[PDB]
Amino acid sequence: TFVALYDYESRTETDLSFKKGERLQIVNNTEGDWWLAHSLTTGQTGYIPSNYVAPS
Amino acid sequence: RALPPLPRY
């Protein structure tokens, strides 16, 4: 269970952006600050930084 | 890939 604390608004068309309060499915953690998250709503990819999310 | 800058601070 990972919650997006701060909204992530990168400046690239690859990593997706999210808002605060949106849950994200962490795919790979305890490895690189940037993990690959997947949304269960639209069912798409979305790389989210680690300093913007935290286990709840 | 530096981490994203913190919000206004």
Short mmCIF file of C-alpha atoms in Angstrom, two decimals:
data_model
loop_
_atom_site.label_atom_id
_atom_site.label_comp_id
_atom_site.label_asym_id
_atom_site.label_seq_id
_atom_site.Cartn_x
_atom_site.Cartn_y
_atom_site.Cartn_z
CA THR A 1 0.00 0.00 0.00
CA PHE A 2 1.70 3.23 -1.13
CA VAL A 3 0.16 6.73 -0.91
CA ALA A 4 1.38 9.69 -3.00
CA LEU A 5 2.24 12.31 -0.36
CA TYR A 6 3.41 15.10 -2.69
CA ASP A 7 2.04 15.52 -6.23
CA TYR A 8 4.55 14.39 -8.87
CA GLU A 9 4.74 16.65 -11.95
CA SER A 10 7.89 15.70 -13.88
CA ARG A 11 8.65 17.37 -17.23
CA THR A 12 8.80 14.32 -19.53
CA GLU A 13 6.21 12.39 -21.56
CA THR A 14 7.40 9.07 -20.06
CA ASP A 15 6.98 9.18 -16.26
CA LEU A 16 3.33 9.96 -15.47
CA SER A 17 2.28 12.60 -12.93
CA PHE A 18 -0.10 12.15 -9.97
CA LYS A 19 -1.61 14.26 -7.17
CA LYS A 20 -1.54 14.06 -3.35
CA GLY A 21 -3.96 11.43 -1.98
CA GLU A 22 -3.79 9.17 -5.06
CA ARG A 23 -2.74 5.57 -4.31
CA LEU A 24 -0.19 3.91 -6.64
CA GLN A 25 0.73 0.23 -7.08
CA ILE A 26 4.48 0.13 -6.35
CA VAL A 27 6.07 -2.47 -8.66
CA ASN A 28 9.73 -2.25 -7.62
CA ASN A 29 10.86 -0.66 -4.33
CA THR A 30 13.80 -0.93 -1.90
CA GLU A 31 16.00 -0.43 -4.98
CA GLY A 32 16.07 2.86 -6.92
CA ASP A 33 14.50 6.09 -5.60
CA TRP A 34 12.36 6.09 -8.76
CA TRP A 35 10.00 3.07 -8.78
CA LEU A 36 7.55 1.90 -11.46
CA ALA A 37 3.96 2.38 -10.27
CA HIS A 38 0.76 1.23 -12.00
CA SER A 39 -2.72 2.77 -11.59
CA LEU A 40 -5.57 0.29 -11.02
CA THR A 41 -8.19 2.84 -12.14
CA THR A 42 -7.32 3.40 -15.82
CA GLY A 43 -4.85 0.49 -15.74
CA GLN A 44 -1.78 2.29 -17.13
CA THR A 45 1.90 2.75 -16.20
CA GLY A 46 3.16 5.65 -14.06
CA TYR A 47 6.71 5.96 -12.69
CA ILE A 48 6.55 7.73 -9.30
CA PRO A 49 9.47 9.12 -7.28
CA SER A 50 10.09 7.81 -3.74
CA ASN A 51 10.31 11.22 -2.00
CA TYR A 52 6.72 11.83 -3.16
CA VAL A 53 5.18 8.63 -1.73
CA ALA A 54 5.43 6.51 1.44
CA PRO A 55 4.01 3.29 2.90
CA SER A 56 0.79 3.83 4.89
CA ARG B 1 17.79 11.38 -12.49
CA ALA B 2 17.82 13.68 -9.44
CA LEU B 3 14.64 13.42 -7.34
CA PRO B 4 11.85 15.97 -7.87
CA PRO B 5 12.36 19.30 -6.09
CA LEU B 6 10.27 19.71 -2.91
CA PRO B 7 7.18 21.94 -3.06
CA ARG B 8 7.53 25.70 -2.49
CA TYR B 9 9.82 25.98 0.56
#
